[PDB]
């Protein structure tokens, strides 16, 4: 069982965040997003445009749970992946991390009629927030804080 699952949006400082998280506690890092190309040796782009979302979430799911069973240390979370009924309830009892930030603050840590950027990636948060809360045993704000004080502050919560 991973020592934390982390999980949250882009920009939300996941990749920063886990990276410190897992030397704080001298595990590794496991990202399942790299994790699913490692196994099927096909880039994501390649086994959805191939394969179709559907195929895609299996094969993520599949790459969860055996991550969820054989890694000890800190495990990073597809930002998709709870959208897998699946995958939540693979996640039950486990020391899940939502780092959490706002539709406007992940704006600012992100960029450079139909929607702009800004309008699809507020709706893709409304869709994902909700699911987020729903499987996390912690919430973390990184709103304003560093990396490094958000690490110490899943420490000071962690078992």
């Not at 998280?21 to 390649?46: F, N, P």
């Not at 240390?73 to 039950?92: D, E, I, M, Q, Y």
């Not at 406007?104 to 948060?125: C, I, S």
């Amino acid at each position: 069982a991973p020592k934390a699952v982390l999980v949250g949006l882009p920009g939300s400082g996941k990749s920063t965040i886990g990276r410190r998280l897992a030397k704080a506690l001298g595990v590794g890092l496991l990202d399942t997003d790299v994790a699913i190309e490692q196994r099927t040796g096909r880039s994501i782009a390649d086994i959805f445009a191939t394969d179709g979302e559907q195929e895609f979430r299996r094969i993520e799911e599949d790459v969860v749970r055996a991550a969820l069973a054989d890694h000890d240390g800190v495990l990073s979370l597809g930002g998709g992946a709870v959208t897998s009924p699946g995958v939540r309830a693979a996640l039950a009892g486990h020391t899940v991390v939502y780092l959490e930030i706002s539709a406007a603050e992940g704006v600012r840590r992100t960029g450079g009629a139909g929607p702009d950027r800004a309008e699809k990636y507020r709706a893709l948060m409304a869709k994902r927030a909700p699911l987020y809360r729903r499987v996390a045993t912690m919430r973390v704000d990184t709103n304003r804080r560093n990396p490094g004080a958000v690490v110490r502050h899943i420490l000071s919560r962690l078992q």
